[PDB]
Design a protein around this nucleic acid. Structure first.
Ligand code: CL
Ligand code: CL
Ligand code: CL
Ligand code: CL
Ligand code: NA
Ligand code: NA
Ligand code: NA
Ligand code: NA
Ligand code: NA
Ligand code: NA
Ligand code: NA
Ligand code: NA
Length: 327
DNA sequence: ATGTGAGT
DNA sequence: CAAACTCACAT
């Protein structure tokens, strides 16, 4: 499926429009849910009325489906795609920190392009100015090779700080991807657990260190548990400077760390299959904890975890290398 | 204290 | 994966 892709693409495009251009949250979700229930449907849809049988597909989407099936297009959508305001809003919204709200306010004031934004930084917050500054860099893919260099700096700086620190770079990179959008590091320390006294300094000290060595270059945000900023590989002497990259560093309690590393290594299909097989065996898995599931169905109290291996063991699956976590 | 916003 | 959850900024 496959089957009804044209209709689902149609609705995903209507959703985006309602979220990013109207600011009608309920219509956005209405379209998301409709696109989802349709993508699950086993038959090639032939009428709006057939789709209307599906929960979440109502009168109005049935009408649109009818037009789409008849002509292969949707007038509403062709108008949206020709609309400059909509195009501009979607463009601005590609700057990190700029979402639909700021986007409206900016296009309303005639600010629509990168050049335009760079002439109106007084209109932007810190996050958004960082996003404009590295707009091009942040849109480049990161090759595995640089990801690997980056991974070493943080893993090394972290070790030399405190050998008890555990730091892991996750996402598709961890599954062996050839390129990456950004770097998502999960961090923990054995004297930081869920039953303990909350220690921001654990994160802050490694952020500060990565700033000392001039690896972290800008901060988008930094709280007690979550850091989001910008990094840059060092360039030798003069010559060509590396592009600035997005990096997040998240501090997780030690007793929830590996569910974290698992959840955030993906893939989504692999997670879905994993947390669904876990149901079959009688356990619920989220990003934090794996818990058993009683006869009633509702149950809790987390099981002790100290590796990804453990989680696999609980649900009676052989361990799967991150390389093999496609599905 | 609360609400809006943004990103993951 | 949507939803939840962090954090920034305002008032
Ligand atoms: Cl202007
Ligand atoms: Cl501002
Ligand atoms: Cl990579
Ligand atoms: Cl995983
Ligand atoms: Na808007
Ligand atoms: Na709905
Ligand atoms: Na009904
Ligand atoms: Na409609
Ligand atoms: Na963005
Ligand atoms: Na100005
Ligand atoms: Na990543
Ligand atoms: Na943050």
């Amino acid at each position: 499926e496959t089957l009804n892709g044209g209709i689902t693409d149609m609705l995903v495009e209507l959703a985006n429009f309602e979220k990013n251009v109207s600011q009608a949250i309920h219509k956005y979700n209405a379209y998301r849910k409709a696109a989802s229930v349709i993508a699950k449907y086993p038959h090639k849809i032939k009428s709006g009325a057939e789709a209307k049988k599906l929960p979440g597909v109502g009168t109005k989407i049935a009408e649109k489906i009818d037009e789409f099936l008849a002509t292969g297009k949707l007038r509403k959508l062709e108008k949206i795609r020709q609309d400059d305001t909509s195009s501009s809003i979607n463009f601005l919204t590609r700057v990190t920190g700029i979402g639909p709200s700021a986007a409206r306010k900016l296009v309303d004031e005639g600010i629509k392009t990168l050049e335009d934004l760079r002439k109106n930084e007084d209109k932007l917050n810190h996050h958004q100015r960082i996003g404009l500054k590295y707009f091009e860099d942040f849109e480049k893919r990161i090759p595995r090779e640089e990801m690997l260099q980056m991974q070493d700096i943080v893993l090394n700086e972290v070790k030399k700080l405190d050998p008890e620190y555990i730091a892991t770079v996750c996402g598709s990179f961890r599954r062996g991807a050839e390129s990456s959008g950004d770097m998502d590091v999960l961090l923990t320390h054995p004297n930081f657990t869920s039953e303990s006294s909350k220690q921001p300094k654990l994160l802050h000290r490694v952020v500060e260190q990565l700033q000392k060595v001039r690896f972290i270059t800008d901060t988008l945000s930094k709280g007690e548990t979550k850091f989001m900023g910008v990094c840059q590989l060092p360039s030798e002497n003069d010559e060509n400077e590396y592009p600035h990259r997005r990096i997040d560093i998240r501090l997780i309690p030690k007793d929830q760390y590996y569910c974290g590393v698992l959840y955030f290594t993906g893939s989504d299909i692999f997670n879905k299959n994993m947390r669904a097989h876990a149901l079959e065996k009688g356990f619920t898995i989220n990003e934090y904890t794996i818990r058993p599931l009683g006869v009633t169905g509702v149950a809790g109290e987390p099981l002790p975890v100290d590796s990804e291996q453990d989680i696999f063991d609980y649900i009676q699956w052989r361990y799967r290398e991150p390389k093999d976590r496609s599905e």
